[PDB]
DNA sequence: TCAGTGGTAAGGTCAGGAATGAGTC
DNA sequence: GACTCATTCCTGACCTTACCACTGA
């Protein structure tokens, strides 16, 4: 990938530059403690030399550092560090870009040397470069070049001279003299460990051929900080870090060509510009009244130097570059000279605002480079750009005015204002000037609000005049006047930019919801934007219309939420009664490459500033694809809708923008009863989801309400889950003992308490695969993600009819139309239509029974009874065939039932509906398509299904060995705590056919040394179940099925060898996958070598388990290893040659196993000395980290690395 | 002002084949 | 001069859960 190099390099470059700046600041006596407090040292001046603690500098540097100290007090230390770091990074990147394109006058490279790695070409042409840059002191430099030493100082002087020369062209990025940042430039630039080496030889020089590279830098420099700050409340200083992305080029072209190009083409329909714009959309045919209305406002002529384009959040300047291209085409069409166009465009067409200085620097550099591509003599003229960063007003009020001395030069310096001094307009009045006071009062919190600040248009022209005077006082004034003007210019310039009215506003606004916005921004939004205070992009969308003149265009790409969510309903009304929709492309998710996830789902629109309710917009539906496919579809004008008036959006209550809905569906939807207040929201813990919720297998069943009797601490809860219909997702339990006293002590939100333990339906709030509802029996609670539906005391609708309706294709389509924003909130579900019928109830009952039968066939459900294979006593292959037939019968029955339901629904409405995503999917584990996903072809999961079935059989056998299950009775047998009551169960005869282990420790060895070896007991289980006569073929079938998918086949081995290899290699991972990182059989392993491994049943563990494990399993194993090692030593001397080679090579393995087992035995003795007791109520996650490194995969389960004694 | 219910998110995890790289033989 | 395993390397698919926000008494 082209962007991989920059993506890897940029954050590391940020870290390196920050470290260098911090070190340089510490050398200057400026530092911050752990808490962040300033630690400015005291400067001691002796022998015309300043000292800051231990370090010393010449006296000449004393004043400059003082300014840095001021910047350390008026702003934070971290702000100063970040600013200096990215300033130097941007300067170096700009120099590199200009040297790779030959834009430097001397024509030699600065940061590198062609065809010579780790060299600088500038040092080979010192006289020429010195004459070009430092004519007054070239000879001395030559002398330095003659010295042979002190090359670092020479290179530093040359680089600083290059920067000072570049100051004139780009005042926004380079300084000229008395620059504080020169003190922070790192030394040892020419060495092999400098910051320049990474920049030079970490990015290929072929990546600098286009301006686009700049944009990538703009995104990749700050990615780590974005990851650090995202997800919580964002401070004002961190606002840019969370909202800085790079917009794809085709989206920008679509936005620009349909706003500026459209304005040009309206006046000049027959112009050679439409052929140069690939993304220009032809308007649909309109009624004669609409055409007559439009023709009455179109001007008869447009002057090219009158089109004003503004980017309220310029960022890297991509939108400005595309606008520049379009305007250059327009100027060339009008017939201007080629080399004069760029200056005109940059001086009277392009305007840009940003809240971050880095973005302003990058945008200015990008615009200048794009102009330089066309004009050779540019960068030598005083081109003044109108792309700025907003500055917060904190300077003094009257001191700057006194320094300015306006009356001395022209007039209005003592009391002359826009009005008389004594008028005292509004509250700001005129302490020095009416206009100046009013302007400065508006930017007291600029670094938080940005471009949302409103400036009256009536003050525009006056401001302009004032600005002009400043432009003359910075060139034709004394020192005080020059510095006062240089201080005042940015505020007046930003005010004038905000006070102007524009033909088009094109932007990609920041996205930030209610959680991320801080208090000041939130209260400002509440006061100023009542209809769009819930998000930042909505505020930008509403504020952009106030910056437009009449008949202007607003073109933006933002979140799709405002199209559908209720929080923006009022906003939509305000849009449908005052504005005109021109065009829209709905992009959905997977747009904006280099961004992952489905939170960001976007739409790009162009809207006019006038009102016409009978206009027909053009819509494109580009939701379901990736970025390249979306671009190709947009280029081919695919998925177009042009048959809906703008007023027609107001027929549906709430006025959603549902452009792709059909008229018949709308008519059916309007005249149909809704679900109503039957749907309610579930409970929610305050911040303790991991304290009160468990998975069912990891607690005792005596305290489980669904299984136990009397006392109940744990209750089943519906929490959502993946797509599943009519039954399932019964996997979570909550602590609700004594009516949730512990929950009430935690200030939990127990919503709708009176509906608990009732039967009803439940759906998943957060989903991206479609809508589904499942039956919920009595004795259940429901979470906020598992919101529920309940029937009234006596209503005409039963719960089964509602379930039948909600799982049909009609409701699926309607839910897709109503809730396309990743959430199915209760208020949106409350308006789903419901249909009353009689057959639907029995059809839903049959579907629920089938789904329950499908769900209860695995160990993961607490209603599991027994393994399905062992019910047939004929043969293992015969049992597998019967199992497959049973699953097929279930699948066919459910298919028929759903088909009948859909037919009944369709014959009532009177029309057929289009199939939607997973509209006909059957959500059963008996269906391989649902279980293993969709492949390119069918009949490709037979081997995987067979392997999974055999693995489940082996897991059931292990569970029978542990005593969890039995062959004499169905369901769970022993799931209590601390091995209490197991002796009574064993004495009663619950394991008569297949006895259980006497202590709950199963050695997972690689030999038949132990009598309770797992492989031998699996063989015994197979013999007991399917008889003795056909044992060998059953074992062969099991081994072949395991080798099909679970493990790789081996050249030569028997069935038992394959079983042992699977048990020692794959069983643990399968168990962890099945129980989802909450195991009930814990694996104790010695290490990378299988010296000793065992399985312990969690429910049979007690404080005497480790001692028994050490005594009965580890010490005899050590004795056996010692005896075996002693045996091999005797045979080595007797044998010789190649005969003894195998003995020698196996003795080393035996020695390694013995040493590892001794270390593990020492650790086990230490941990067994402390009698460790665990409470199952604490959960597997907490209890799994109490044994150090004795357990396997501690980090994957607990989440943190195991500790060492 | 506090109860009692609803709303929303420039994201976060995870299975699952392709590289990548140290032991064997 | 290949084999054989144990780590990354994305890559596409899928659902949070905490903390606001909005009425009634
Ligand atoms: C995603 S960038 C878009 C830049 C440009 N469209 C591009 O693709 O390069 C959004 C920018 O808006 C800026 N921004 C955030 N909040 C702002 C505010 N309140 N006022 C003005 N600009 C703001 C951020 O600094 C950020 O750089
Ligand atoms: Mg045992």
mmCIF file with all atom_site columns, C-alpha atoms and ligand atoms in Angstrom, chain A residues 996-1003 1011-1012 1095 1100 1108 1113, ligand 2:
data_model
loop_
_atom_site.group_PDB
_atom_site.id
_atom_site.type_symbol
_atom_site.label_atom_id
_atom_site.label_alt_id
_atom_site.label_comp_id
_atom_site.label_asym_id
_atom_site.label_entity_id
_atom_site.label_seq_id
_atom_site.pdbx_PDB_ins_code
_atom_site.Cartn_x
_atom_site.Cartn_y
_atom_site.Cartn_z
_atom_site.occupancy
_atom_site.B_iso_or_equiv
_atom_site.pdbx_formal_charge
_atom_site.auth_seq_id
_atom_site.auth_comp_id
_atom_site.auth_asym_id
_atom_site.auth_atom_id
_atom_site.pdbx_PDB_model_num
ATOM   1  C  CA  . UNK A 1 996  ? -16.669 -40.673 37.543 1.00 0.00 ? 996  UNK A CA  1
ATOM   2  C  CA  . UNK A 1 997  ? -13.242 -39.621 38.779 1.00 0.00 ? 997  UNK A CA  1
ATOM   3  C  CA  . UNK A 1 998  ? -12.710 -39.807 42.532 1.00 0.00 ? 998  UNK A CA  1
ATOM   4  C  CA  . UNK A 1 999  ? -11.008 -36.401 42.921 1.00 0.00 ? 999  UNK A CA  1
ATOM   5  C  CA  . UNK A 1 1000 ? -11.770 -34.339 39.801 1.00 0.00 ? 1000 UNK A CA  1
ATOM   6  C  CA  . UNK A 1 1001 ? -8.202  -34.243 38.436 1.00 0.00 ? 1001 UNK A CA  1
ATOM   7  C  CA  . UNK A 1 1002 ? -7.701  -35.787 34.992 1.00 0.00 ? 1002 UNK A CA  1
ATOM   8  C  CA  . UNK A 1 1003 ? -4.054  -36.242 33.892 1.00 0.00 ? 1003 UNK A CA  1
ATOM   9  C  CA  . UNK A 1 1011 ? -5.155  -45.342 35.376 1.00 0.00 ? 1011 UNK A CA  1
ATOM   10 C  CA  . UNK A 1 1012 ? -7.382  -42.273 34.870 1.00 0.00 ? 1012 UNK A CA  1
ATOM   11 C  CA  . UNK A 1 1095 ? -7.648  -30.828 33.857 1.00 0.00 ? 1095 UNK A CA  1
ATOM   12 C  CA  . UNK A 1 1100 ? -15.043 -29.776 42.465 1.00 0.00 ? 1100 UNK A CA  1
ATOM   13 C  CA  . UNK A 1 1108 ? -3.383  -33.799 46.301 1.00 0.00 ? 1108 UNK A CA  1
ATOM   14 C  CA  . UNK A 1 1113 ? 0.591   -36.942 40.375 1.00 0.00 ? 1113 UNK A CA  1
HETATM 15 MG MG1 . LIG D 2 .    ? -8.307  -38.318 39.272 1.00 0.00 ? 2    LIG D MG1 1
#
